[PDB]
Write a protein that binds this ligand. Structure first.
Ligand SMILES: OC[C@H]1O[C@H](O[C@H]2[C@H](O)[C@@H](O)[C@@H](O)O[C@@H]2CO)[C@H](O)[C@@H](O)[C@@H]1O
Length: 434
């Protein structure tokens, strides 16, 4: 069951994973259960691949938006906290991790992007995106720049795209309408057009990523960046005199960050589920466990009420909640992964000049719709095939299964499984339809 009596933990490399290891060390000394904290690249994409074969980590930390996909694939254990435990965390944080009637993770912290600014270069931060070009020109004559932030992940560019009306999936009357995608509307195009104009007018570079922007801010070379609470401890070390504030408006509208609840899920494949539960409830989600993580890299506004009451007068936390309140909670629905992959490509293509903004966003909308149409078709044709076979209509069953095969990511493995599931002459019939 890879493995044994230890916990492997995956968490992103921008989080306080060393502080999480200290909590793990403590758990190991009270318990004999060794804890290993890892931060693989692209873990949020790795996990479903590896968990679907029955391995990967015992525990996975990510923002709640990925977890309904993982859950709908059966990759996550149900969590079952007792009454007392439930009451210790904020209800709305539990809502971010409730999927099809079950809790599928523990909430840890509420994350939103803020504007971070260097008070020695910009004692008053801009109110508006539209003020940035002029500040940048002024700062350029002094050998500095106004703003650098990660352009390679769409999470960072979302606040601006969404400001004037962009959205992912329409939410209305208690559900998402996955047919109603907001990536390609005029508000989304205005925001992304403003971003591309910043680049064209040399106020930003299309290839800036997390590290380039972090270095430039932490060394005093750019007056502003856009980042989450996790970034604050490196800025503390750098000695920059910084503030954390409300993101600027665009066309008189607030920037609208996507809000994430950092969450800890348990792999359905783990043979260590009770131990993971013990670690999360009795070690991590306590004032001291969160403090150990937070002092390594800040979590933001935490889901544990008792620790969060310690945090509320930190102006950086006030700015985080203010931005979060102008923003929107990410959906946790399985279709979010198609959304992010389409949007990432669009923003990169537009920023680098490989596509126009109009074209980049149209193709994004198209690619979301197609990916979801193909998924629905695969699943329906699988089901239809199985239902026909179970009623004895062998050829029509096989025909549907062949439709499923033609669109599958793994047609050879599907062929292998079907050789084991079908009577040999029904398998022979299937081979003639390939
Ligand atoms: O850029 C797409 C990406 O956005 C979010 O990932 C965030 C994550 O929520 C934060 O905790 C932090 O680590 O930064 C990430 C962005 O680089 C979504 O959660 C994720 O699913 C999505 O791919």
């Amino acid at each position: 069951k890879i493995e044994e009596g230890k916990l492997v933990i995956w968490i992103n490399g921008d989080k306080g994973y060393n502080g999480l290891a200290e909590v793990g060390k403590k758990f190991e000394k009270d318990t004999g259960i060794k804890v290993t904290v890892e931060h693989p690249d692209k873990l949020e994409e790795k996990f479903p691949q590896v968990a679907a074969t029955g391995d990967g980590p015992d525990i996975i930390f990510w923002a709640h938006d990925r977890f309904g996909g993982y859950a709908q694939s059966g990759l996550l254990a149900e969590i079952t906290p007792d009454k007392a435990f439930q009451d210790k965390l904020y209800p709305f944080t539990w809502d971010a991790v409730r999927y099809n009637g079950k809790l599928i993770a523990y909430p840890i912290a509420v994350e939103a992007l803020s504007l971070i600014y260097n008070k020695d270069l910009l004692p008053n931060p801009p109110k508006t995106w539209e003020e940035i070009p002029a500040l940048d020109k002024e700062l350029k004559a002094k050998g500095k720049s106004a703003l650098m932030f990660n352009l390679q992940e769409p999470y960072f560019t979302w606040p601006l795209i969404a400001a004037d009306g962009g959205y992912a999936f329409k939410y209305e009357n208690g559900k998402y309408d996955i047919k109603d995608v907001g990536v390609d509307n005029a508000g989304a195009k205005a925001g992304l057009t403003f971003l591309v104009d910043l680049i064209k007018n040399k106020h930003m570079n299309a290839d800036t990523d997390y590290s380039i922007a972090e270095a430039a801010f932490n060394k005093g070379e750019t007056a502003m960046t856009i980042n989450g609470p996790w970034a604050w401890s490196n800025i503390d070390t750098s000695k920059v005199n910084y503030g954390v504030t409300v993101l600027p408006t665009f066309k008189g509208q607030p920037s609208k960050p996507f809000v994430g609840v950092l969450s800890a899920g348990i792999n359905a494949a783990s043979p260590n589920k009770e131990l993971a539960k013990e670690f999360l409830e009795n070690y991590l989600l306590t004032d001291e466990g969160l403090e150990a993580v937070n002092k390594d890299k800040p979590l933001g506004a935490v889901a544990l009420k008792s620790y969060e009451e310690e945090l509320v007068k930190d102006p950086r936390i006030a700015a985080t909640m203010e931005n979060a309140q102008k923003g929107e909670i990410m959906p946790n629905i399985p279709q979010m992964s198609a959304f992010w992959y389409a949007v990432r490509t669009a923003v990169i293509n537009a920023a680098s000049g490989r596509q126009t903004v109009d074209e980049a966003l149209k193709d994004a909308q198209t690619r979301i719709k197609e990916a979801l149409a193909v998924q629905k078709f695969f699943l329906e044709e699988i089901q239809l095939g199985e239902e026909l076979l179970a009623q004895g209509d062998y050829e029509k069953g096989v025909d549907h299964l062949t439709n499923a095969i033609a669109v599958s990511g793994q047609p050879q493995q599907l062929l292998q499984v079907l050789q084991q599931t079908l009577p040999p002459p029904v398998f022979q019939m299937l081979l003639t339809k390939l």
